[PDB]
């Protein structure tokens, strides 16, 4: 502890972590704006473990002289870390989760840079010096959720990219339908008649999208999911638990039908899926917004020497092209429909074209979660949002979309400055 640890700063210059020298000789870790991006800034605690940047960039932040403790402070001084996080967007995301459990990720679609990353409930660093699904879980990257209908984005992308369907192709979308010996149902058993795929997607018909998933087959469904990041521990410089899909060979038709609507119901050796992180949902939206090119997200922009010189800069890196540019353009158009006339009207913001996909998924004892992935502006997107609002007793139907749209609009205004 005699070696001064480097600082952690936002892209807009807000210091979130500093080490301060003491007369004693040692350094104490200070956290200005304590409470901001806590899970991302992280900590090193005996009781609570290690997390975030303090942990992952520990060496950067962290010979004859080594044998002398009195000289530790002299030779080495840790380098600082500038994050991609913008403090104003981070504040926007934190304000939007007040009163709720869940998370939000805002990301640049062309690079995968994480501009805001918020999990709720959260905590302060002061609180770690006391006794405390807890606040410590990072719901953006280390909690897995059934994505529900937000995953239809992947089903749609795969259907179009394999040239098995088009947005104007019609589908029967009844209230209930037998598939693989089990029943699939639209929400509220709504019978929508025969409708084009773009409308089945905007209105989020499970019966229609399940039919597409069965037409694709398990290999295709899983393969496309993986091409968007499933099975990868996303993040160049932060830890994300991989999103999961089953071994396609173990899937049944009924399982496949539900999986295509974002509900993991499989029973077999491999995991049931899809199970997703919010960060993964953001990566999917970004890929779609970025002409199909998937980017490995990152949260460190650059590293600075104690003197203030740039030691290294992170380079954006692609995880591949999951779908063609033509496919991505069709998926974007379908997502515009979700917001302009479908289940995502709550995301609309006057004067800006926002596109996205909603989902709602049942969890334990009558609880359900609301999801939204989206991007803006529709034409030439410069931001992507991914949201989950956990209901845990409260009815949060459509909340993801409302939070998502509000966050995108506020972040676009910040970008314009
Ligand atoms: C996708 O998520 C869909 N979900 C369902 O039909 C199951 O939905 C619910 C579970 C619990 C409580 C209420 C609904 C279809 N898409 C949803 C969406 O948010 O887009 C939906 C509610 C419109 S139906």
- For the chain, the structural domain boundaries read 1-22+26-56+72-83+122-132+301-314, 84-121+133-300+315-417
Residue 357's nearest CA partner among 201, 173, 174 is: 201
Q: State which of 210, 343, 360 you would mutate to test the pocket of ligand 1, scoring each by most atoms of that ligand within 8 A of its C-beta.
A: 360
Q: Is 117 left (phi over 0), alpha (psi -120 to 50) or beta?
A: beta
Give residues with Cβ within 8 angstroms of 49, minimum separation 6: none
**Cis bond leading into 377, ω under 30°?**
yes
Beta bridge partners of 401: none
Of 166, 106, 140, 154, nearest to 381 by C-alpha is 106
Q: Is the bond preceding 121 in cis, omega lying within 30 degrees of 0?
A: yes
Alpha carbon separation from 283 to 117, 121, 151, 153, 294 (Å, rounded): 13, 23, 12, 12, 7
d(CA 84, CA 402): 25
Cα separation of 234 and 237, whole Å?
9
DSSP 8-state secondary structure symbol assigned to residue 243:
P
Instruction: Check if 31 has its Cβ closer than 6 Å to any atom of ligand 1.
Output: no
Strand-pair category, 101-107 with 15-21: unpaired
Residue 38 CB less than 6 A away from ligand 1:
no
Whether residue 178 has its Cβ less than 6 Å from ligand 1: no
What is the DSSP secondary structure assignment for residue 394, as one 8-state letter?
S
Residues linked to residue 107 through DSSP beta bridges, in sequence order: 114, 384
Atom of ligand 1 nearest to the CA of 401: 19
- Asked if 198 and 242 touch (Cβ cutoff 8 Å), the reply is no
**Closest alpha carbon to 90 in 61, 58, 120:** 120
Q: CA triplet 258, 324, 340: central angle to 5 degrees? A: 65
Joined together, the tokens standing for residue 26 give 């040692």
Q: 């119901």: which residue's tokens?
A: 265
Q: What single-letter DSSP state applies at residue 79?
A: P
Cα–Cα distance measured from residue 318 to residue 324, given in angstroms and rounded to the nearest whole number: 14
User: In angstroms, how far is CA 284 from the centroid of its own chain?
Assistant: 9
Q: HSE-up of 73 (CA within 13 Å, CB side)?
A: 13
Which of 382, 335, 390, 345 lies closest to 89 in space, CA to CA? 382
Two tokens, residue 131:
């006794």
- Give phi and psi for 118, each to the nearest 5: -135, 130
Helices 152-161/206-216 angle, 10° precision: 50
What is the rounded distance in angstroms from the CA atom of residue 10 to the CA atom of residue 307?
Answer: 18
Ligand 1 closest atom vs CA 361: 10
Cα 259–262–268 angle (5° rounding)?
Answer: 40
Q: Report CA-CA distances (Å) from 280 to 72, 147, 403.
A: 42, 10, 18
Output the CA 368–ligand 1 centroid distance in Å: 9
Q: Report the 10 Å Cβ neighbour count for 64.
A: 6
Q: Which of 370, 413, 407, 417 is nearest to 392 (CA)?
A: 370
Torsional sign, CA 380, 281, 103, 13: negative
* Shortest-distance atom of ligand 1 to CA 395: 12
Just give the CATH number of 84-121+133-300+315-417: 3.40.710.10
Query: Within 10 Å of residue 187's Cβ, how many Cβ atoms?
Result: 14
Q: Is the CB of 368 under 6 A from ligand 1?
A: yes
Residues 262, 152 contacting (CB under 8 angstroms): yes
- The technique is X-ray
Q: Do residues 184 and 207 lie in contact, with contact meaning Cβ atoms separated by under 8 Å? A: yes
Alpha-carbon span 300 to 16, nearest angstrom: 14
- What are the distances in angstroms from CA 194 to CA 173, 316, 327? 6, 44, 23
Closest CA to 388 of 408, 364, 368, 406: 368
Which residues, at least 6 apart from 381, have a Cβ–Cβ distance to it below 8 Å? 109, 289, 290, 375
Q: Which spans in 243-380 are helix H?
A: 253-259, 278-289, 325-341
- Length in residues, the chain: 417
H or E segment and range at residue 56: helix 52-56
**Under the phi-then-psi rule, with left for phi > 0, alpha for psi from -120 to 50, and beta for the rest, what region is 66?**
alpha
Tokens 């998926």, residue?
331
Q: Is 39 left (phi over 0), alpha (psi -120 to 50) or beta?
A: alpha
| Beta carbon of 360 within 6 Å of any ligand 1 atom | yes
**Best residue among 147, 149, 259 to mutate for probing ligand 1, ranked by most atoms within 8 Å of CB:** 149
Which residue in 11, 6, 13, 242 sits closest to 143, CA to CA? 242
Establish whether the linkage from the previous residue to 167 is cis, with ω within 30° of 0. Answer: no
* C-alpha 150 – ligand 1 centre gap (Å): 10
For 203, the 3-state DSSP assignment is coil
Instruction: Report whether residue 281 contacts ligand 1, using a CB cutoff of 6 Å.
Output: no
Query: Do residues 119 and 39 lie in contact, with contact meaning Cβ atoms separated by under 8 Å?
Result: yes
* Closest Cα to atom 5 of ligand 1: 187
Task: For residue 371, give the ligand 1 atom closest to its CA.
Answer: 19
Whose Cα sits closest to atom 24 in ligand 1?
Answer: 187
CB neighbours of 380 closer than 8 A, spacing ≥ 6? none
Burial class of residue 286 (count of CB atoms within 10 Å of its CB; 0-12, 13-18, 19+)? buried
In whole angstroms, give the CA distance from residue 104 to residue 101: 10
Structure tokens at 210: 């399940």
Q: Are the C-beta atoms of 275 and 146 separated by less than 8 Å? A: yes
Close Cβ partners of 307 (under 8 Å, ≥ 6 residues apart): none
C-alpha span between 121 and 289 (Å, rounded):
29
How open is the CA angle 138-109-380, to the nearest 5 degrees?
Answer: 145
Task: Report how far residue 357's alpha carbon sits from residue 276's, in angstroms, rounded to the nearest whole number.
Answer: 15
For ligand 1, the distance from its centroid to the CA atom of residue 361, given in whole angstroms, is 6
- Give me the resolution in angstroms, 1 decimal: 1.9
3-state secondary structure of 349: strand
Extract the tokens encoding 238: 């932060």
The architecture of the domain spanning 1-22+26-56+72-83+122-132+301-314 is Alpha-Beta Complex (3.90)
Of ligand 1's atoms, which has the minimum distance to the CA of residue 370? Answer: 19
CA angle 263, 283, 145 (to 5 degrees): 30
Q: Is the CB of 148 under 6 A from ligand 1?
A: yes
Task: Return the SS3 of 168.
Answer: coil
Question: What's the CA gap between 292 and 283, in Å, rounded?
Answer: 11
């Amino acid at each position: 502890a005699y070696v001064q640890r480097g600082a952690i700063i936002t892209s807009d210059g807000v210091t979130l972590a500093e080490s301060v020298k003491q007369d004693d000789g040692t350094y104490v870790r200070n956290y200005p704006h304590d409470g901001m991006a806590s899970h991302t800034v992280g900590y090193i605690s005996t009781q609570y473990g290690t997390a975030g940047i303090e942990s992952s960039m520990n060496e950067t932040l962290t010979d004859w002289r080594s044998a002398l403790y009195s000289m530790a402070g002299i030779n080495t001084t840790g380098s600082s870390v500038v994050l991609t996080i913008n403090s104003q967007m981070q504040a926007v995301a934190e304000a939007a989760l007040q009163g709720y459990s869940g998370s939000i990720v805002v990301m640049d679609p062309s690079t995968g840079a994480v501009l805001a990353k918020a999990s709720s409930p959260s905590y302060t660093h002061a609180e770690l010096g006391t006794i405390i699904g807890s606040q410590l879980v990072d719901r953006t990257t280390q909690a897995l959720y059934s994505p529900g209908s937000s995953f239809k984005t992947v089903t749609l992308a795969a259907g179009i990219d394999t040239h098995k369907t088009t947005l104007d192709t019609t589908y029967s979308a009844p209230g209930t339908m037998e598939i693989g010996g089990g029943t699939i149902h639209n929400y509220a058993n709504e019978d929508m008649g025969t409708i084009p795929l773009r409308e089945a997607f905007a209105r989020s018909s499970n019966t229609a999208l399940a039919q597409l998933g069965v037409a694709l087959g398990a290999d295709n469904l899983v393969s496309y999911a993986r091409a968007f990041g499933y099975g990868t521990a996303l993040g160049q410089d932060f830890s994300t638990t991989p999103s999961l899909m089953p071994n396609p060979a173990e899937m049944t038709t009924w399982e496949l039908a539900w999986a295509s609507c974002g509900l993991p119901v499989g029973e077999h050796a491999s995991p049931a899926g899809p199970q997703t992180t919010v960060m993964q949902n953001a990566v999917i939206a970004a890929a779609i917004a970025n002409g199909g090119v998937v980017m490995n997200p990152y949260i460190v922009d650059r590293v600075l020497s104690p003197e203030g010189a740039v030691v290294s800069t992170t380079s954006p890196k692609s995880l591949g092209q999951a779908v063609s540019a033509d496919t991505a353009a069709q998926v974007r158009e379908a997502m515009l429909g979700v917001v302009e006339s479908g289940t995502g009207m709550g995301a609309r913001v006057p004067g800006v074209k926002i596109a996205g996909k909603t989902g709602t998924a049942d969890v334990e004892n009558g609880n359900f979660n609301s999801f939204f992935i989206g991007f803006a502006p529709y034409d030439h997107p410069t931001l992507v949002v991914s949201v989950v609002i956990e209901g845990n007793g409260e009815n949060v139907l459509g909340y993801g979309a409302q939070v998502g749209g509000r966050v995108l609009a506020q972040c676009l205004n910040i970008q314009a400055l």
